[PDB]
Design a protein around this ligand. Structure first.
Ligand SMILES: [Cl-]
Ligand SMILES: [Cl-]
Ligand SMILES: [Cl-]
Lengths: 223, 225, 221
């Protein structure tokens, strides 16, 4: 009885000792786990700061991207506006380039036709002066013919003549008349008063019973 | 005895208590193991997050470079559009001024061609008219030529028989026995009618003494007795 | 027997000391368990924030990609336009000079044409005056002829005859023309009782039988 209780007391001494050993091993393991807790919480706080920093940069980046999107859209509308203006300018200037070239051709045509008309005016004036000069000469010839008519014409009746209009008349006193042939003749009183014609010749008419003509042409008496 | 039993009872309580302590130590080990399982889990999650964090900030650096380049590209593009826009304004000005001046030139050479065509016709029209007057002049010259020829052939210019031309005066010219009175009438010289020739009226006669001479029926001087 | 009781009492004390240490470990476990709960709340919240940042970043990547393409596209269009404007610059400044030269050329044409138009008027006026002065001269000649036609002899009246341009006296009995073209009397050669003494006509008489009395008649002596 005494020996049995004494042995269970020593067994208790050894079990207590062993339990303290086992207890100390668990306490060490708990101390390791607390070290891990502290390491985890440090990492947690460090990671939270990095999270804030990154999310901050990402939001700041997104502000710059939205500004860029907005600018691109604005640039897009400006380029949209410029292109048709340039289209229209191409159409306009290509038509002007043709129209200018045609104008240069038309101006050279005008110069040619003006130059030729200038020479034509000179040519024809010179020609018409030539015809006028020839005509003036002809007039001078007529004028010469008029002067010759003027200096050879008869305008004035002199001795024995009388002008009536454009007619001249011989004017005569006694002893002469004009016969039915318009000839100037002597008037011998119808040859009944001693003087007569023999042919064209004047004679004294004589009774040849009593008169003759002698060799002097005088009248004389016969027998 | 009674004191031996009190020791025995405490020794038994101590056996029970050591047993209790060992079961409590087993329960602490269970809880320690469960906690280590939670820590394990936590460490794995921290590892996922750390890796994702490194990936993200790396992705953000490359994105940053692309954005910076885009912003810089955009500025350059804005400068080219800003330069081009007033050039187009300027071209709108030149082409609209060229348009007006070209239309004006086109109407101008239209007018010129019309003016030049009228002047050509005028030159034709006047040369015709002038040739007209010259050819009419030639008509008049001929008409006057003909009138001069007609006058040339009909006029008296030359003194013929019994005549003499002094200047533009004509005179009858006479031999012996003829003269002209104050009136320019031609006359005969009858010797004052004192030598047997006389006038009675306009006619000539032999002036005769009628004691001795008479005219016979035949017109001859005869003797009366 | 007393030493047995003393070790029992020591064992009671040691058991009490071990239970005290056991409770201390239990406290630590409780604190640690609370840390674990707190750690899992904080982690869950941080994981959600990370997912949100990742989602934002991938959206941003795609938006940045689109912007880079649009930029390139815009650069193409600017690059298409710039040389077109350059060419239009050149061509319109050439056209500007060609237009100005055309304007100077059309101006010269107007000037020259206006002078030619005036030249035509000037020369027609000079030529018309020459023609008019020539009509006047013919007119002068015509009226001068007319006035000489009313005064000139053209027609033969009494004792005259016209042959061409020659006017002749014509004569019958008793008259003829001597070889000085003079009119003269035909007295039958003065053989027939009529003749001249000096300038005067006489009855030629044999003065052995006849004479002239005071009355000029022929009588017997
Ligand atoms: Cl961007
Ligand atoms: Cl004990
Ligand atoms: Cl003329």
């Amino acid at each position: 009885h005494m020996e049995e209780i004494k042995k269970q007391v020593q067994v208790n001494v050894d079990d207590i000792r062993a339990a303290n050993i086992k207890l100390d091993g668990l306490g060490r393991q708990i101390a390791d786990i607390s070290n891990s807790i502290s390491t985890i919480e440090s990492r947690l706080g460090e990671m939270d700061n990095r999270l804030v920093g990154i999310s901050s940069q990402v939001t700041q980046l997104s502000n710059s991207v939205s500004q860029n999107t907005q600018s691109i859209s604005s640039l897009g509308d400006r380029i949209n506006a410029v292109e048709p203006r340039v289209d229209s300018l191409d159409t306009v200037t290509s038509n002007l380039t043709g129209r200018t070239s045609t104008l240069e051709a038309d101006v050279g045509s005008l110069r040619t036709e003006l130059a030729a008309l200038t020479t034509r005016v000179t040519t024809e004036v010179t020609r018409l002066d030539g015809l006028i000069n020839s005509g003036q000469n002809s007039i001078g010839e007529l004028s010469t013919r008029l002067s010759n008519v003027e200096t050879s014409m008869v305008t004035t009746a002199g001795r024995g003549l009388q002008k009536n209009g454009n007619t001249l008349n011989v004017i005569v006193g006694n002893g002469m008349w004009f016969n039915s042939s318009n000839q100037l003749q002597l008037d011998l009183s119808g040859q009944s008063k001693g003087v007569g014609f023999v042919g064209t010749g004047m004679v004294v008419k004589i009774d040849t019973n009593y008169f003759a003509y002698n060799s002097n042409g005088e009248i004389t008496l016969v027998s």
